């Protein structure tokens with residue numbers, strides 16, 4: 001079951017990538033950079049999840065290490081997408097964007113180190129990752145939202161919608177991680193696998209459908 | 220012999236790097252970034268192949284020359300950056316297209332490494348994903364990236380076309396050698412593969428940048 | 442004691458990061474990028490040294506302990522430190538990102554040769570070490586030559602600040618390979634505990650000390 005769920009996920013990622021590629025050819029005022037980011041996220045994730053489907057991107061708790069290889073690239077790119085949405089039609093703040101990238105890469109590395117750790121040490125690393133996530137959300141709903149508001153009512157309305165979308169999904173990851181085999185071990189592996197199949201379909205493909213459709217409608 | 224071939228390779232990389240350094244001191248309208256990229260590629264490749272010469276950048280698994288992937292994951296995106304910057308010479312940069320090539324290329328090299336670690340059907344899935352990435356890189360090279368070159372005038376576009384064809388002819392030899400040698404079908408012997416992955420990169424790295432830098436320098440006015 | 446020294450270091454990195462965050466809130470003409478770099482350096486280093494304090498970021502190898510988390514630290518914190526130095530030289534003028542990325546490439550190479558030297562034994566170790574020292578010498582040539590000439594092109598006052606931080610950085614930087622060679626990774630003349638103390642005290646000055654000196658001096662131009 002675990003193998004065919006990962007093959008299915010990789011196929012959905014490939015269809016999302018092809019959809020974003022088709023949109024890119026009639027871009028309706030959205031810069032090519034947004035289409036490139038929207039394609040890299042699912043292709044990279046698709047490849048990492050294909051490695052799990054093939055029996056390769058895990059070692060035996062089972063550590064699904066290919067998830068961290070995925071997220072360490074896909075998650076900073078998602079925050080770049082969200083930052084570029086806030087900045088659409090205005091000056092870029094690349095400092096703020098790279099602040100999110102740095103927090104996010106740190107967050108994913110702490111999760112990988114937490115997974116390889118035992119006891120108190122595990123929850124130290126996990127806590128540092130959660131703190132990085134809180135700072136990401138403070139930026140999202142604070143200074144980054146203020147840039148979105150500076151770019152007019154329609155853009156700020158779209159940004160708010162994708163900020164809530166992204167944030168609601170993002171808080172689910174560390175919650176599932178803590179409940180599952182990597183943390184307290186209350187949730188079963190098969191549950192956790194389905195959560196880390198379904199959540200990222202929404203976080204990667206769903207998010208960029210919502211984001212690119214909104215930005216395109218501003219044309 | 221395999222150790223000595225890697226030492227010789229590393230020495231040629233050093234000479235190439237020092238030659239590009241010397242050109243950089245009299246740049247003839249070529250920006251400093253082209254000289255930097257042309258130096259990093261052979262110095263990085265030189266270090267990676269030195270590790271193979273010393274017996275460190277390889278392991279038994281059949282021998283995996285893993286230091287080749289450490290080499291290519293840096294030197295190959297930089298070579299595509301060089302090609303892209305040639306297409307954009309005298310005109311506006313399209314860094315979105317440049318980074319598209321980087322992303323495709325890093326993915327291609329990683330699928331190679333994973334293919335080398337794999338056995339059976341799995342090996343050929345990773346290899347095929349790498350080949351698809353290469354095909355897209357060549358579609359970009361001869362389609363949108365060439366249209367940028369054509370926008371920068373006749374002489375630049377002629378040079379771009381020479382460099383693009385030179386790169387493409389060498390680049391298709393890599394996955395061809397991979398598939399024929401011990402990592403794939405095991406038709407060619409280890410030594411044969413080693414010599415191909417010594418001689419190809421001398422032309423791909425040092426050769427490419429000699430052609431590219433000389434062609435850009437010739438466009439210089441006074 | 443080694444564990445407690447690392448906990449104390451991480452705490453000092455966190456206090457430094459918080460000080461730079463507080464300065465960033467009233468920035469006095471210094472761009473946000475300088476404050477971000479000044480925060481990332483100590484947070485990253487603090488995390489890497491936390492892994493040593495917890496007993497994770499080290500292993501036994503040749504009957505000696507490799508503090509591998511130092512190289513994880515330095516491969517990110519050291520290129521950021523050179524970026525901070527380069528941005529100081531360019532303050533009030535056109536950026537030279539080519540020269541900045543030249544220093545980043547040299548620096549990342551230098552740290553990687555150190556890591557490989559640490560994993561090596563005999564002649565091989567000193568080959569890798571020597572390549573990293575060559576990279577450091579080139580970094581220092583850049584720092585006191587072309588990068589200082591950029592600082593001089595941004596006027597007397599900026600160039601005086603640049604020269605101060607260039608000397609500060611360089612004096613600490615030459616200590617690292619010196620300690621490395623004397624200590625258990627090299628000749629084994631200095632004891633493990635001495636090398637641990639050196640690689641605690643030096644980085645407090647290199648990371649937090651450097652950004653205090655750099656940011657105070659830039660803020661005073663306001």
Ligand SMILES: CCCCCCCC/C=C/CCCCCCCC(=O)O
Pocket residue numbers: 092093094095096098099101102103105106474477478481485517
């Ligand atoms: C945890 C990994 C650490 C990686 C560090 C990455 C971030 C630090 C680097 C600095 C980025 C600064 C960006 C400068 C852009 C200025 C232009 C602008 O603000 O629009």
Ligand SMILES: CCCCCCCC/C=C/CCCCCCCC(=O)O
Pocket residue numbers: 251252255256259263293536537538539540542543545546547549550
């Ligand atoms: C050892 C690993 C090497 C990794 C770093 C490689 C860096 C090579 C890339 C070149 C960057 C070019 C900088 C862009 C130039 C813009 C114009 C300028 O301000 O000079």
Ligand code: NA
Pocket residue numbers: 034080081082083084085211
């Ligand atoms: Na976006």
Ligand code: NA
Pocket residue numbers: 253300301302303304305431
């Ligand atoms: Na070029």
Ligand code: NA
Pocket residue numbers: 475524525526527528529655
């Ligand atoms: Na600075």
